Ligand binder design. Structure first.
Ligand SMILES: Nc1ncnc2c1ncn2[C@H]1O[C@@H](COP(=O)(O)OP(=O)(O)OP(O)(O)=S)[C@H](O)[C@H]1O
Ligand SMILES: Nc1ncnc2c1ncn2[C@@H]1O[C@@H](COP(=O)(O)OP(=O)(O)O)[C@H](O)[C@H]1O
Lengths: 578, 116
């Protein structure tokens, strides 16, 4: 074993092992397990960057230090150098005789415990040479007999794949759940390790920089657990401090340097890591009101809800907001969503829910179950969000979706996250969810019977309440009802459409001047309360685009030119010569 | 033991992947009597998988012991547990391990959890 295992107690004695910070109950449970006559091999199961191996070293520390009960005190914990044993490759030869010599030494020394890091190498495998397969068979009886004790270390995903697949181990090993440490513990870990970073980079860190690395990393870096993400921030700040200021060589790293690395590590703007886009938010109300006309209460309701979330009033685990838009057709319920994402400078992730009417949508949005082609995808939704954690997410015409999509939505609205079918998860805390529906467009054309007409309209919202059950509705921030467009709005609508026509004409060298009377005339011709603005587009196309097309192709506007439109007393469009 | 685990490749890949194929004809002739070992869900997928074994083995339904039987198995081994841990358990403690475990262990059967 002398060239196969490392005496961890010796590392603790020489200084290879540092004292563990916190984790008192983790060490106590490992010893409670080791002392059992059945199922006495503890396994540390967790996630990368939480101290799983630091804890096993930490136990050797306490065994040496004298911080454990006399039963454990002075026992010896050794790690297993898997690489050294596998290196025997040519082969065994010495692989098997030395492994057996190890077991004989350990069997004889019942005061010996092995620590096996990266336990999934052997358990559920052993495939590294195959030598670990019968090595496991020669370990199992000694774990059972109480001759050899083993402390393992793996992750949750491997645990299920390696230990839950073998009854012999299910009956021999005890899982211990290892979570990340606290903010204070993380700072203590960094300060414990710190001289190793300062010496490496020829930098020094302030106390504040260390605290900031831990807290800023939590706020913006959502990829890892605290020990490592905060350490990476410290190391990255160290690395840039020794790199960037070639002409200045500032030696001390402060919180300002931490903010710059957190912004880059976290993929967020260098401004946003600290200073918010207060002006972007202040200007949403006006920028959106200048694009979609007539929906003033709707724009404000959306804008205010976003601001409250951005002001920090709400829950940190939830999406930025969740709103269902509804109303008559041709009113801008999708147009405003598109403009929202532009106004905020945020990429729009868009799904047409009419493409998910079947029972085969889960397999696309979440990912196919393992064994199915497409299980390899993280889900179209999951992947879009992971790539773009800051996003406006639009689910167009949600009422057409197969009902299973609602379970996906309910989970996200409650926890801010969606896992894939492989282990990754999307973080929706930075996206805005907008769903639209046309349930509320249902209406009639029939009037009352009598000489004097009266308004016989029904109560809007009933069409939503009957489709979307309370579980869904009660999790929305709101339902924004959009109204019908008025005639004043139509005049504004005509103007934006005339502008679009001019842009197309500029490309051909043609200048179009429509008179005010002509505009008032078109506005009247296209007004239809029940069809929103879509008829205005038709009216403009029919009255202006049509004769222009003939001239552009066959006549006077081939080489560019001047076009104007006057209104006749006869209500004709007196188009201009050229 | 764990006959449902050799259905893949014998002890491990690279060994007797055909161990089952060698066993089928000896069982059919009755050369070696074989005692199988499967679980409730494993049986329906391991023996029913191949008629050459499904039609050879007889199914015995094994269920857990009762509260007093759990106490009896603890008492059977009690001297060992006491010797093993240099402790003594009261009669009440043994009964409590069983009587209380059924209210808290929930998912694993009682016979082992009361012992744990
Ligand atoms: N209130 C408005 N002000 C300015 N432009 C608008 C307005 N409403 C719609 N538009 C334009 O935006 C397009 C139609 O948009 P939407 O009404 O949002 O389509 P939609 O969201 O899919 O809703 P429906 O019910 O399916 S028609 C057309 O280009 C125009 O009608
Ligand atoms: N409270 C803590 N104090 C010191 N180190 C900690 C603490 N929590 C987690 N760690 C880290 O736990 C260990 C995680 O990595 P380690 O155990 O060395 O190997 P592995 O990458 O296989 O898990 C590190 O030693 C250490 O940085």
């Amino acid at each position: 074993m002398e060239n196969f295992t490392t005496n961890l107690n010796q590392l603790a004695r020489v200084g290879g092992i540092d004292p563990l910070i916190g984790r008192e109950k983790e060490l106590e449970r490992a010893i409670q397990v080791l002392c059992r006559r059945r199922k006495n091999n503890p396994l540390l199961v967790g996630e990368s960057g939480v101290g799983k191996t630091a804890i096993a070293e930490g136990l050797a520390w306490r065994i040496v230090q004298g911080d454990v009960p006399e039963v454990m005190a002075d026992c010896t914990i050794y790690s297993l150098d898997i690489g050294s044993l596998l290196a025997g490759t040519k082969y065994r030869g010495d692989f098997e005789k030395r492994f057996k010599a190890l077991l004989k030494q350990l069997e004889q020394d019942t005061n010996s415990i092995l620590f096996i890091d990266e336990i999934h190498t052997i358990i559920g495998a052993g495939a590294a040479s195959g030598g670990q397969v019968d090595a496991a068979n020669l370990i199992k009886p000694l774990l059972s007999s109480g001759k050899i004790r083993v402390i393992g270390s793996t992750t949750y995903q491997e645990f299920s794949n390696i230990f839950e697949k073998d009854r012999a181990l299910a009956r021999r090993f005890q899982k211990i759940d290892i979570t990340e440490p606290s903010i204070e513990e993380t700072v203590q870990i960094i300060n414990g390790l710190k001289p190793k970073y300062e010496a490496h980079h020829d930098v020094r860190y302030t106390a504040k920089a260390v605290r900031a690395a831990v807290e800023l990393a939590v706020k913006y870096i959502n990829d890892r657990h605290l020990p490592d993400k905060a350490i990476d921030v410290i190391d990255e700040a160290g690395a840039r401090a020794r790199l960037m200021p070639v002409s200045k060589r500032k030696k001390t790293v402060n919180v300002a340097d931490i903010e710059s690395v957190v912004a880059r590590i976290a993929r967020i703007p260098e401004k946003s890591v600290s200073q918010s886009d207060r002006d972007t938010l202040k200007n949403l109300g006006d920028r959106l009101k200048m694009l979609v006309f007539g929906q003033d209460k709707a724009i404000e309701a959306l804008t205010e809800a976003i601001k409250m979330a951005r002001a920090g009033l709400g829950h940190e685990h939830k999406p930025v907001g969740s709103f269902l838009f509804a109303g008559p057709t041709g009113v801008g319920k999708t147009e405003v969503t598109v403009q929202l994402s532009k106004a905020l400078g945020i990429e729009l992730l868009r799904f047409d829910m009419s493409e998910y009417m079947e029972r085969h949508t889960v397999s696309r949005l979440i990912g196919a179950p393992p064994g199915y082609v497409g299980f390899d995808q993280g889900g179209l939704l999951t992947d879009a969000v992971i790539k773009h954690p800051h996003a406006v997410l639009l689910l167009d015409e949600i009422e057409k979706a197969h009902p299973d999509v609602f379970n996906i939505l309910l989970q996200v609205m409650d926890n801010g996250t969606l896992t894939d079918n492989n282990g990754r998860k999307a973080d929706f805390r930075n996206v805005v969810l907008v769903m639209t529906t046309n349930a509320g467009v249902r209406e009639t054309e029939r009037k009352s019977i009598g000489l004097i007409h009266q308004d016989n309209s029904t109560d809007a919202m009933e069409e939503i309440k009957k489709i979307f059950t309370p579980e869904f509705r009660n999790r929305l921030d709101n339902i924004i009802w959009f109204d019908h467009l008025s005639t004043d709005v139509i005049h504004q609508v005509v103007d934006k459409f005339i502008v679009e026509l001019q842009v197309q004409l500029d490309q051909k060298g043609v200048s179009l001047e429509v008179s005010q009377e002509a505009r008032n005339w078109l506005a009247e011709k296209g007004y239809d309360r029940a069809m929103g603005a879509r008829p205005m587009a038709r009216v403009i196309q029919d009255n202006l685009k049509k004769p222009l097309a003939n001239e552009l192709l066959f006549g006077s506007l081939v080489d560019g030119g001047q076009v104007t439109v006057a209104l006749d007393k006869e209500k004709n469009e007196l188009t201009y010569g050229f």
